Structures are given as structure tokens and as C-alpha cells.
Amino acid sequence: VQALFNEISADAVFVTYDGQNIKKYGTHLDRAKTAYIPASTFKIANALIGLENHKATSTEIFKWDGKPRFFKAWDKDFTLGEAMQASTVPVYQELARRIGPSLMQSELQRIGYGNMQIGTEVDQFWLKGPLTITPIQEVKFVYDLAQGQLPFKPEVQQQVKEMLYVERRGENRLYAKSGWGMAVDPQVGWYVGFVEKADGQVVAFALNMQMKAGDDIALRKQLSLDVLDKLGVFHYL
Numbered sequence: 154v155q156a157l158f159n160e161i162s163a164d165a166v167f168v169t170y171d172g173q174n175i176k177k178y179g180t181h182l183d184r185a186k187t188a189y190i191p192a193s194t195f196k197i198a199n200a201l202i203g204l205e206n207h208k209a210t211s212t213e214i215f216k217w218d219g220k221p222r223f224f225k226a227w228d229k230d231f232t233l234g235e236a237m238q239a240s241t242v243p244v245y246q247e248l249a250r251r252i253g254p255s256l257m258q259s260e261l262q263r264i265g266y267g268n269m270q271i272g273t274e275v276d277q278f279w280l281k282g283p284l285t286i287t288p289i290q291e292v293k294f295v296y297d298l299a300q301g302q303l304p305f306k307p308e309v310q311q312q313v314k315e316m317l318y319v320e321r322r323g324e325n326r327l328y329a330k331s332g333w334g335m336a337v338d339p340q341v342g343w344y345v346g347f348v349e350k351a352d353g354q355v356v357a358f359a360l361n362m363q364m365k366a367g368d369d370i371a372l373r374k375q376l377s378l379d380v381l382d383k384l385g386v387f388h389y390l
């Protein structure tokens with residue numbers, strides 16, 4: 154596990170949580186207590202707040218408006234779950250605008266998300282600050298989500314859990330969300346989620362690492378799945 158991490162120029166930390174024990178791996182363990190912008194991982198909290206406050210449903214289609222978006226892959230219609238796995242920022246900015254700054258600010262404080270700051274811009278706060286969050290806070294947030302223990306309706310947490318369903322491996326289920334914050338210096342990479350193992354135990358995790366523009370998009374998930382296989386949490390099929 155440690156030889157894998159410094160096989161790159163990787164400034165990285167990988168955190169796991171089983172509900173009692175926080176474990177740290179990687180080349181820079183202090184990253185786990187350091188706060189970073191959530192970037193696209195905020196789409197987990199955005200969906201939860203939006204569904205809880207009746208601003209959207211998990212079957213509604215957010216239709217493209219015709220204007221070219223940041224990635225051509227985003228130039229189509231999306232449900233919240235489809236936009237979750239595509240990381241479609243414009244769909245979740247439209248949701249944040251439905252929520253509004255005062256409700257969004259009040260809700261993030263209610264659930265104690267990160268530093269609980271959003272400032273004035275309701276569609277920018279998770280992309281360039283001031284909202285920050287540590288990897289430990291991230292593992293504990295998605296772990297609570299996995300257990301239905303966040304301050305949200307149970308069916309709301311279940312809907313967002315399904316939005317994160319990315320792989321079935323026998324009787325083991327992986328739930329995950331990627332993040333790449335490019336509008337900050339330095340750039341930050343996220344891969345957070347949890348494995349619902351075949352034996353019934355849940356293990357939440359969060360990769361958090363420094364990025365630069367040349368980096369391959371698939372590196373975060375590869376690293377995370379590689380480590381999870383080593384840990385025995387999620388063996389390769």
C-alpha cells in the first residue's frame with residue numbers, strides 16, 4: 154500500500170472509516186486534517202439539501218438549454234443521479250439556485266458540513282471557496298449517508314445513495330463520487346464513497362490528493378480501487 158503511493162509524485166492521503174476507527178494511508182497524512190474545497194463532491198450535499206427541501210426530485214430531467222457547457226459530455230439532459238456520475242456542474246448550479254443562498258447557508262450549518270461557509274454566491278461557493286472540508290469530515294459525511302444517519306429524511310438519504318451507486322462486484326457494492334477543483338491553487342483531487350461489503354460491513358473512504366492539469370482523470374479512481382483491493386475492503390473481481 155505504501156509502495157503504491159510513492160510510485161507517483163503523489164502528495165496523497167487515503168482515509169477509511171468503519172464507524173469507530175479512522176485509518177490513514179498515503180504519502181502526506183496531514184492532508185486528512187487539512188481543509189480543501191469540496192469541488193464536485195459537494196453534489197452529494199447539494200442533492201440531499203435539494204431533495205429534503207422539495208426543490209427537485211430524483212426522476213426530474215434537467216434538460217439542456219442549448220448553450221455549450223464546459224465539457225461536451227455535459228451538453229445533454231440529466232437526472233440528478235445521471236448528473237451526479239457525470240459531475241454535471243450546470244445541473245447542480247441550477248439546483249443550488251432553486252435552493253437559494255439563505256436556505257443553502259442555513260442547511261449546511263444545520264448538518265455541520267465542513268466550515269459551513271458559502272458567502273454570497275450560491276452557485277460558486279463549493280468551487281472556489283469559502284466552503285472547505287477535511288477528508289476526515291468527508292469520510293464521516295458519506296459514512297453517515299451510508300448508515301442513514303445524516304440529518305435528512307431516510308428516503309432522501311436512500312435516493313442520494315442510489316445516485317452514487319457505481320459498481321456491483323459479487324455481493325459487494327461500491328458507492329463513490331469524484332472531485333477535481335481546478336479553480337483553486339493548488340488543485341485538489343477527491344475520490345470519496347463507501348463499499349457495502351458482502352458480509353454486511355460498510356467501509357467509507359476518501360482519497361484526497363494534489364492535482365495538476367496534465368494528470369489523467371482516471372488516476373483518482375484507479376488509486377482508490379487499487380488501495381481498497383490491497384486493504385481487502387474491495388477485492389478486484
Ligand SMILES: *C(=O)[C@@H]([C@@H]1N=C(C(=O)O)[C@@H](S[C@@H]2CN[C@H](C(=O)N(C)C)C2)[C@@H]1C)[C@@H](C)O
Pocket residue numbers: 191192193194224226238239240242280331332333334370
Ligand atoms: C468536480 O469536481 C468537477 C468535475 N469532476 C470531474 C471528475 O471528477 O472527473 C470532472 S467530470 C469530466 C467530464 N465527465 C467525465 C466523467 O466523469 N465521466 C466520463 C465519467 C470527466 C469535472 C472536472 C467539476 C466541478 O468541474
